[PDB]
Amino acid sequence: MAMDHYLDIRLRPDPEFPPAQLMSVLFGKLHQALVAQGGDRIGVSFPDLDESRSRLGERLRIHASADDLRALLARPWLEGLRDHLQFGEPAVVPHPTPYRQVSRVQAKSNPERLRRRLMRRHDLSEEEARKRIPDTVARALDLPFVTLRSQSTGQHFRLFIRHGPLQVTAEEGGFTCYGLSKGGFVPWF
Amino acid sequence: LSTASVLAFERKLDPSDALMSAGAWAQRDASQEWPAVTVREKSQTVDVANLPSDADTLKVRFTLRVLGGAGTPSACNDAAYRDKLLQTVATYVNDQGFAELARRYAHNLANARFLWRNRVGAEAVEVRINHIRQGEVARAWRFDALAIGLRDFKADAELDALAELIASGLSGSGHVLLEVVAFARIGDGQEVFPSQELKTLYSVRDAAAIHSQKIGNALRTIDTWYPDEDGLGPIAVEPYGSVTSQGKAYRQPKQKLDFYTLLDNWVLRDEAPAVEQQHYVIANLIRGGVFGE
């Protein structure tokens, strides 16, 4: 926990979008700025969620610095949510701070994924494909997120994600492109 | 004296269907002859459509209709209810001008309040609105949605002329006919979100349109006297107002600020609800519905 980039921000109310109706736009306007724009000294955390309540977004919680995340207060790439949101700037963090566990990982729940794999790897079709394939091992990761409707359909798909524990020690460096800890202790202030 | 068993009010600012259509840039001054959008379905069996590769543009097409004199109703059973409603509607008319409604109408005309989900990740918004008397136009505008922020009502120089025009409109001082159309910046190969019915995106033939009620909703985001928290912004005007998107229903009937009791008090026995309620009252009279017994 060497960085001291805590930038808090709040929400804004709008009538033309639900939580997914701006969460899919957040997934569209954060990943490309973290990919085509990029920056390993910039990301996000998830320190204010819950399991049963399904709290996905409740406040500004980012991880930046004096130069890498210093363009998070003069950025016209996030312009348009002035009817539904806002942002802040980084503040001086203290010595003893926490570090929450998160992950922006991909969970898979295919019970017929063995059949779609064997269609190009085994030739075992759907007729005899119920002998030893995983019928219920492909579980679902139920959690609250936005409903990103890709070309498969217009319905709101669930945003699977795994939380983590809380350790007093920290780990500075780099995480995945989504900000979830792929080896690095994520921030939770 | 008591309530009104039947009531029927007539709508104001009715739009047509906002067809989508495409194009390019620097041909936006030659947009009489322009192409359209397509509708296709993919693999469940649902619909999803898309712009081409030549086009960031998307286009809007609708036109408006004021009538004038909205206090006087068109269906009742009590003649005495009319004889008790006329003093109230004339009292609200004569003592002040209707421009407070008109700013909050005409900035939603000027902003991208009707381009609801057409700026979820946009960069430059340019809207052009016509005042049509006859076969040409004679008072042309071209508005911007970057300037006035989508939750406050702070007026600019363009807004007062359109406000006094529409306030001449809905008060009976001259019929106006707006045409409010827009040009978008979407994305080169980007998924569209048109309307539906009660999956199938609502497809007008060889185009794609959204219905009348979405824009007849969008141009009357006038409720910002709803009780609980006024820092949020404008939501629309409904008697027993419930909203799915923000979830919580404003203006509950178990405390006294819903439409069905302030109408009883403001109209009949000539006692006044607040001056921070009046334009919401007359916006309810603009909307219309069956307000019975």
Swiss-Prot record, chain A:
Q: Which Gene3D superfamilies match?
A: CRISPR-associated endoribonuclease Cas6/Csy4 (3.30.70.2540)
Q: What UniProt keywords apply to this chain's record, in alphabetical order?
A: Antiviral defense, Endonuclease, Hydrolase, Nuclease, RNA-binding
- What function does the entry list? CRISPR (clustered regularly interspaced short palindromic repeat) is an adaptive immune system that provides protection against mobile genetic elements (viruses, transposable elements and conjugative plasmids). CRISPR clusters contain sequences complementary to antecedent mobile elements and target invading nucleic acids. CRISPR clusters are transcribed and processed into CRISPR RNA (crRNA). Processes pre-crRNA into individual crRNA units. Absolutely required for crRNA production or stability.
One Pfam family of this protein, by short name?
Cas_Csy4
- The organism encoding this protein is Pseudomonas aeruginosa (strain UCBPP-PA14)
Q: Name one GO biological process term.
A: maintenance of CRISPR repeat elements
Q: How is the cofactor bound?
A: Metal-ion independent.
Q: What is the effect of changing Y178A?
A: Cleaves pre-crRNA 130-fold slower
Please share what else the UniProt entry notes about this protein. Answer: In this bacteria, Y.pestis-subtype CRISPRs do not confer resistance to phage DMS3 or MP22, but instead are required for DMS3-dependent inhibition of biofilm formation and possibly motility.
Give the protein's recorded name.
CRISPR-associated endonuclease Cas6/Csy4
UniProt KW GTP-binding keyword = no
Family classification: Belongs to the CRISPR-associated endoribonuclease Cas6 family. Cas6f/Csy4, subtype I-F/Ypest subfamily.
Q: What happens when the gene is disrupted?
A: Infection with phage DMS3 inhibits biofilm formation; disrupting this gene restores biofilm formation despite DMS3 infection. Normal biofilm formation in the absence of phage infection. Loss of production of crRNA in the presence or absence of phage. Disruption of the entire Y.pestis-subtype CRISPR region disrupts crRNA production but does not alter phage resistance (possibly OLNs PA14_33350 to PA14_33310, plus the flanking CRISPR loci), indicating this CRISPR is not involved in phage resistance.
Q: What is the effect of changing F157A?
A: Very little pre-crRNA cleavage, still binds crRNA
Superkingdom: Bacteria
- Quaternary state and partners of this protein? Part of the Csy ribonucleoprotein complex with a probable stoichiometry of Csy1(1),Csy2(1),Csy3(6),Cas6/Csy4(1)-crRNA(1). A Csy3(6),Cas6/Csy4(1)-crRNA(1) subcomplex is also formed.
Residues at site: Substrate binding? S150
- Cite the effect that the entry attributes to H31K: Cleaves pre-crRNA 130-fold slower
Swiss-Prot record, chain B:
Q: Set out the biological process GO terms recorded for this chain's protein.
A: defense response to virus
| Alphabetical keyword list | Antiviral defense
Q: Name one Pfam family in it.
A: Cas_Csy3
Q: Where are the transmembrane segments?
A: none
**Loss of function: phenotype:** Mutants lose phage DMS3 infection-dependent inhibition of biofilm formation while there is normal biofilm formation in the absence of phage infection. Decreased production of crRNA in the presence or absence of phage. Disruption of the entire Y.pestis-subtype CRISPR region disrupts crRNA production but does not alter phage resistance (possibly OLNs PA14_33350 to PA14_33310, and the flanking CRISPR loci), indicating this CRISPR is not involved in phage resistance.
Say what the protein does. Answer: CRISPR (clustered regularly interspaced short palindromic repeat) is an adaptive immune system that provides protection against mobile genetic elements (viruses, transposable elements and conjugative plasmids). CRISPR clusters contain sequences complementary to antecedent mobile elements and target invading nucleic acids. CRISPR clusters are transcribed and processed into CRISPR RNA (crRNA). Cas3 and Cascade participate in CRISPR interference, the third stage of CRISPR immunity (Potential). Involved in crRNA production or stability.
Q: What else is known?
A: In this bacteria, Y.pestis-subtype CRISPRs do not confer resistance to phage DMS3 or MP22, but instead are required for DMS3 infection-dependent inhibition of biofilm formation and possibly motility.
Q: Indicate the quaternary assembly.
A: Part of the Csy ribonucleoprotein complex with a probable stoichiometry of Csy1(1),Csy2(1),Csy3(6),Cas6/Csy4(1)-crRNA(1). A Csy3(6),Cas6/Csy4(1)-crRNA(1) subcomplex is also formed.
The record's family statement is: Belongs to the CRISPR-associated Csy3 family.
Descriptive protein name: CRISPR-associated protein Csy3
